[PDB]
Design a protein around this ligand. Structure first.
Ligand SMILES: CCc1c[nH]c2ncnc(NCC(C)(C)CC(F)(F)F)c12
Ligand SMILES: [Cl-]
Length: 167
């Protein structure tokens, strides 16, 4: 039993809700919140900009030190950093950004990072400003993630379409 509330169950392990991931993280304080990161951990907009803003830019400060030490992530890769005031940990995961021309096949690799964590609060990878089809991203999530994932979909219209079109 966990503290996530109001989710619709899609499969044995995948759950979904119309929610602002920022507000959801603040309420649940999950062990892991997933960020829709880029390789430079520059948290400018989309989910990343919103999460960082909620940390009062502490996520960005920590991220800049991470990059200065380690260099950029790989597309499809991830790193674990602090969750600040939102969660114990933040798993920064880089899905491909279609608006940069990146290979959509890397979306599966991106979701594989979730399997290293038993329970996660997450957005749909590569959706929103990353330019992928959110319906496809959900299909890849369900077919790749085996651990327990609670998906937050900000857009109510999109949430309804995701549920109504789910196979
Ligand atoms: C600023 C963005 C954002 C803040 N809080 C969030 N929580 C969840 N998902 C988010 N964005 C991903 C979507 C849901 C695919 C974006 C889209 F497609 F609907 F426009 C956000
Ligand atoms: Cl977005």
């Amino acid at each position: 039993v966990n503290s996530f509330s109001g989710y619709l169950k899609l499969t044995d392990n995948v759950y979904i809700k119309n929610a602002d991931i920022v507000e959801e993280a603040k309420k649940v304080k999950p062990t892991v919140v997933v960020n829709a990161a880029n390789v430079y951990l520059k948290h400018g907009g989309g989910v990343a900009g919103a999460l960082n803003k909620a940390t009062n830019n502490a996520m960005q400060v920590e991220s800049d030190d991470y990059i200065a030490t380690n260099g950029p992530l790989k597309v499809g890769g991830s790193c674990v950093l602090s969750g600040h005031n939102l969660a114990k940990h933040c798993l920064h995961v880089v899905g491909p950004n279609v608006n940069k021309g990146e290979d959509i096949q890397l979306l599966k690799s991106a979701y594989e990072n979730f399997n290293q964590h038993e329970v996660l609060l997450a957005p749909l990878l590569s959706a929103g400003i990353f330019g992928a089809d959110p319906i496809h991203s959900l299909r890849v999530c369900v077919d790749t993630v085996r651990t327990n994932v609670y998906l937050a979909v900000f857009d109510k219209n999109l949430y309804d379409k995701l549920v109504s079109s789910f196979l």
